[PDB]
Structure 1
Amino acid sequence: FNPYTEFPEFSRRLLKDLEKMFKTYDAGRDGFIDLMELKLMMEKLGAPQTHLGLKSMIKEVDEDFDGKLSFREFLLIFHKAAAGELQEDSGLLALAKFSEID
């Protein structure tokens, strides 16, 4: 997976910021942000979500259907937010906008 090819619209500094946020909230360091790590992230960001809200956020970008976010899926959140592709009620929008990222 090349995030430089896949997401050229992202500066290389923005990309390492995103890697940093990703590594922060992947507590277990398995390379994924799972449902509980996402829940904690939305709380620590100040935009807590319902349990089923968190599952629907993951499903929006869970391209391999395993219920957890790999780093390429986590990048896709900000790609979709940046391109205006998120539904207006999506928790991913709140993740992006509460995140300290633009």
Structure 2
Amino acid sequence: FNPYTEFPEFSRRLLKDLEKMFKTYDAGRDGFIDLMELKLMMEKLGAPQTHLGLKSMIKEVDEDFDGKLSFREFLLIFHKAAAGELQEDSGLLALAKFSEID
């Protein structure tokens, strides 16, 4: 995976900022954000989600079907947000807006 060629619209600074926030919420340090870690992240950002809501959020970008977010799927959230590809009521749009990145 090459984030610079996959997401050339992201500055190096934004990529580093997104890596930092991925690592912040991967509490278990396994390289993924699972449902429980996303639950905690959404609470901390000020947009708590239901259990099924969190599952729907992950499913939107879960390209390898494992029910958790890899770093490349996390970046995809922000790519979709900036490209106008998330619905106005998606928990993913709340995640991107309330992350206070950019």
TM-score interval w.r.t. the shorter chain? over 0.9
- How far does residue 55 in structure 1 lie from its aligned partner after superposition? 0.3
Deviations 1:59-98 (A, max 9, x none): 0000011100000000000000000000121100000011
Q: If the length of structure 2 is used for normalisation, what is the TM-score?
A: 0.98
1:64 partner SS? coil
Partner of 2:28: 28
RMSD: 0.5
CA distance in 1, matches of 2:101, 2:49: 19
Q: If the length of structure 1 is used for normalisation, what is the TM-score?
A: 0.98
Deviations 1:15-48 (A, max 9, x none): 0000000000000100000000000000011110
CA distance in 2, matches of 1:24, 1:95: 14
Q: What is the aligned length?
A: 102
Higher RCO (C-alpha under 8 Å, 6+ residues apart): 2
Structure 2 unaligned residues grouped into runs of 5+? none
Aligned sequence identity (%): 100
Structure 1 unaligned residues grouped into runs of 5+? none
CA distance in 2, matches of 1:56, 1:89: 12
- How far does residue 101 in structure 1 lie from its aligned partner after superposition? 1.5
CA distance in 1, matches of 2:42, 2:88: 17
Partner of 2:78: 78
CA distance in 2, matches of 1:16, 1:22: 10
1:36 partner SS? helix
CA distance in 2, matches of 1:24, 1:58: 18
Displaced runs of 4 or more, over 2 A: none
